[PDB]
A paper describes a structure:
The dimeric organization of this novel enzyme appears potentially important for function, with a large, flexible loop reaching over from one protomer to contact the substrate and fully assemble the active site of the neighbouring molecule. BoGH3B was found to co-purify with glucose in its active site. This could readily be modelled with a 4C1 chair conformation, highlighting the position of the −1 sub-site. Within the GH3B active site, putative catalytic nucleophile (Asp314) and acid/base (Glu534) residues can be observed in close proximity to the glucose moiety, poised for nucleophilic attack. Away from the −1 sub-site, the exterior surface structure of the GH3B active pocket deviates from the most closely related homologues, presenting as a more closed structure similar to that seen in the distantly related barley β-glucosidase. GH3B has significant activity for glucose-only oligosaccharides but displays far weaker activity on xyloglucan-derived oligos, which retain their xylose side chains. Similar to barley β-glucosidase, such observations might suggest that the narrowing of the active site cleft could be responsible for the high specificity of BoGH3B towards β-1,4-linked glucans.
Here, we present the three-dimensional structures of BoGH31, BoGH43A, BoGH43B and BoGH3B, expanding our knowledge of the structural determinants required for xyloglucan degradation. While we were unable to determine a structure for BoGH3A, our structural and sequence analysis of BoGH3B has also allowed us to highlight further potential differences between these two enzymes encoded by the operon. Together with existing biochemical data, our analyses of the three-dimensional structures, and various enzyme-inhibitor complexes, of BoGH31, BoGH43A, BoGH43B and BoGH3B provide molecular-level insight into the stepwise breakdown of xyloglucan by the BoXyGUL.
Residue numbers in the entry: 26 to 634, 647 to 782
The structure:
């Protein structure tokens, strides 16, 4: 049955577009071109962003191109500028084609490419909140502020499995667990789109699930190099968030640029047409990632010509090509259709999907609109939500002697290269693609230094970085200036405590590839030199990947992992360090300790017959929580039962906080060697000092199924254990079920 209901009025409109459209118009609707192609750059340098009328005439008038993407001039623009540009684009599209353009933008964590928007912590941070509602509210705000520039389509959310800490895109998704990505991805989709996928309202956008699928586990750790994914992992884990999002009505999917089992995913008919469109009966849009049809020819050599690559990818089930420079795509596809290599059935289906999306977004009736009414843009109300997200994502990993919180009045030596910059805090997909320009445009927001000054007074903060990042040149995200560790060491005698901010500078995608996961040698020497002053040290980790720090964690009294908390991350940190907020974040991935002992939390028991830095689900706070009375309604169950778990959680310390309650399962014996432990549900609860609450968490029996060797889901007769916080119970499945459908439920 269709995952998104059929709107007959939309289908009727589509049928009558398809009867009347020229082949050139149809092909144009399957083509997407990046904004640079239609930009007048010399006039833009002098007078601000300006489109080229002549190039619009070519792209839209002659070739009938149905979609544009990307940020004008490679840098975030004012919403007024966005709106003026999209207006001109739509006036042209309605005049020459009669079909409105769909403009896609990478608004990744709030409005990446719209100035003065509300910027949220990155995906990995949102995972660490274990707060679905907060993720939803973040996406709702991003949608609102995206539509404030007349943009209807966001290339988000990202639901790759961040299971490889070498990978430059580990931070874009919600971490290493497939359940966390599925649930948060669904929360983002609901926020972005609203509750009716057929009528995306004024303040909502179409979501795009990225990057279908298995993108996050390249064998070498290098971006867009081959993964080697097992049959069971592909169905059970990598597919899981896409399955969940599509069933909630996500309107579009972007395909994985990379390769597995010798096949680029853009050429994988089975995964695109069968697993996605046909098995789920899903009428949404599949779009390529950047240049990926041409990559079949030039990068991977599975096509002799670009034209042969078009044939392969379109026949594999792609609907729209992110070319993104060459209107010649249209010529090639037309030739293929005339030759009989690509059928009209396939062209008509692609165009149906493009038009359907456009109708769902109301673009025929409202191709652009007045933006005056979007008066909550950049508001205090929206910022308080981003601040909450940031507070809830920053993880307390170590606190010996309860050195935190730090009392107002103590003198703080602030050190390290991540201590005074918004570029660090944001990472990539922030004002520019690499994030390199963040400090030019993020002056209204607080760096770590600025926030600590507001909390403790400028007079109580001594800032001597010792090590700083070099100025931007050719994606030198790794490069630091010569260390001057001599300086903060000398200044230490005047401080009570040292906070050292370390990790990475901003990068995005392939330029962010690393050759050594170990934290920078200069950064490690800075921490060692400071340790030897005898003053206590608090490490602040600000990075897109968990850099190896096994030699410096023993020298630190406390450690806070902020990951990429973005524009309110400095404020959040200061609020947490002073106890005005209480820590609640938990690790959404496994932090490795040794460079050739990398592992995820759901390892097979042969892997621990297990030496890591901090595990998945770990996080401290300024209070403690007791779990008791773990019960279930049906201790003996089958696939079709609803299991209802309850547990009492009591705040036994002296201050209020939020506890993320995680529910894990363990299959003791199975026909495939079972994951040692698996997250199955979670729920976050607020508790005052001394307060108990009964937390309810529900599962279907079939949630304890796994994908067997033969590719089929099975729930087997036998024993399981359930772990919730500190507490364990026994349950029994009383009968085996094997599914003949590709998916459960
Ligand atoms: O910018 C459009 C697309 O281009 C590619 O570089 C990235 O992999 C995608 O995440 C992005 O949505
Ligand atoms: Mg079993």
């Amino acid at each position: 049955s269709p995952v998104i209901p059929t709107d007959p009025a939309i289908e009727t409109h589509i049928r009558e577009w398809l009867q009347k459209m020229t082949l050139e118009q149809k092909i144009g609707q399957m083509c997407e071109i990046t904004i640079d192609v239609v930009s007048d750059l010399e006039t833009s340098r002098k007078k601000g962003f300006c489109l080229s009328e002549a190039m619009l005439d070519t792209v839209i008038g002659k070739y009938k191109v149905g979609s544009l993407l990307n940020v004008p001039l490679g840098v975030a623009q004012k919403k007024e500028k966005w709106a003026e540009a999209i207006k001109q684009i739509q006036e042209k599209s309605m005049k020459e084609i009669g079909i409105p353009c769909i403009y896609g933008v990478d608004q990744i964590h709030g409005t990446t490419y719209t100035l003065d928007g509300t910027m949220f912590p990155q995906g990995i941070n949102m995972g660490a909140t274990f707060n679905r509602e907060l993720t939803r509210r973040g996406a709702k705000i991003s949608a609102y502020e995206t539509k404030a520039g007349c943009i209807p389509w966001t290339f988000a959310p990202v639901v790759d499995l961040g299971r490889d800490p070498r990978w430059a895109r580990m931070w874009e998704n919600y971490g290493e667990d497939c359940y966390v990505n599925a649930e948060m991805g669904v929360s983002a989709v609901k926020g972005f789109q609203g509750e009716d996928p057929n009528r995306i309202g004024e303040y909502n956008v179409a979501a795009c699930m990225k990057h279908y699928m298995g993108y996050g586990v390249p064998v070498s750790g290098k971006d867009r190099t081959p993964s080697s994914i097992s049959r069971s992992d592909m169905r059970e884990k990598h597919f899981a968030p896409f399955l969940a999002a599509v069933r909630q009505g996500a309107l579009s999917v972007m395909v994985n640029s990379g390769v597995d089992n010798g096949l680029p995913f853009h050429a994988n008919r089975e995964l695109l047409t069968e697993w996605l469109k046909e098995d789920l009966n899903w009428d949404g849009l599949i779009v390529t990632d950047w240049a990926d049809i041409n990559n079949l020819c030039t990068r991977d050599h599975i096509a002799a010509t670009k034209k042969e690559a078009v044939k392969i990818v379109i026949n594999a089930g792609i609907d729209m090509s992110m070319v993104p420079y060459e209107v010649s795509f249209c010529d090639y596809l037309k030739e293929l259709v005339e030759e009989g290599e690509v059928s009209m059935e396939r062209i008509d289906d692609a165009v149906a999907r493009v038009l359907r999306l456009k109708y769902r977004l109301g673009l025929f009736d409202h191709p652009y609109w007045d933006i005056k009414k979007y008066d909550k843009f950049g508001s205090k109300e929206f910022a308080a939500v981003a601040l909450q997200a940031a507070e809830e994502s920053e993880v307390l990993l170590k606190n010996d002697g309860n050195i935190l919180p730090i009392a107002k009045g103590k003198k703080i030596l602030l050190t390290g290269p991540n201590a005074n910059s918004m570029r660090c805090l944001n990472g990539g997909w922030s004002y520019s693609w690499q994030g390199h320009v963040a400090d030019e445009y993020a002056q209204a927001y607080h760096t770590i230094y600025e926030a600590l000054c507001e909390k403790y007074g400028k007079e109580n903060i001594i800032y001597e970085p010792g090590v700083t990042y070099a100025s931007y040149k050719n994606d030198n995200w790794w490069e630091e200036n010569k260390p001057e560790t001599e300086k903060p060491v000398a200044a230490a005698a005047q401080a009570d405590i040292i906070i050292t901010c370390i990790g990475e500078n901003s990068y995005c995608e392939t330029p962010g590839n690393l050759t050594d996961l170990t934290l920078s040698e200069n950064q490690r020497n800075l921490v060692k030199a400071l340790a030897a002053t005898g003053k206590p040290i608090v490490l602040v980790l600000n990075q897109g990947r968990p850099r190896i720090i096994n030699d410096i964690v023993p020298l630190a009294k406390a450690v806070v992992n902020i990951m990429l908390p973005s524009n309110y991350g400095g404020d959040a940190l200061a609020n947490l360090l002073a106890g005005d907020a209480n820590f609640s974040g938990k690790m959404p991935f496994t932090y490795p300790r040794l460079i050739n002992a990398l592992a995820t939390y759901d390892y097979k028991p042969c892997e621990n017959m297990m030496d890591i830095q901090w595990p998945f689900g770990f996080g401290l706070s300024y209070t403690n929580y007791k779990y008791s009375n773990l019960k279930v309604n049906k201790p003996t169950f089958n696939a079709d039962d609803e299991l209802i778990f309850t547990v009492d959680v009591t705040n036994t310390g002296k201050v209020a906080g939020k506890e993320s309650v995680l529910l894990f399962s363990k299959d003791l014996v199975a026909s495939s060697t079972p994951d040692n432990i698996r997250l199955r549900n979670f729920e976050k609860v607020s508790l005052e000092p001394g307060e108990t609450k009964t937390v309810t968490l529900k599962l279907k029996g079939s949630d304890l199924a796994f994908v067997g060797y033969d590719g089929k889901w099975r729930l087997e007769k036998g024993d399981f254990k359930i772990k919730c916080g500190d507490q364990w119970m026994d349950i029994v499945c009383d009968q085996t079920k094997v599914w003949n459908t590709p998916n459960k439920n």
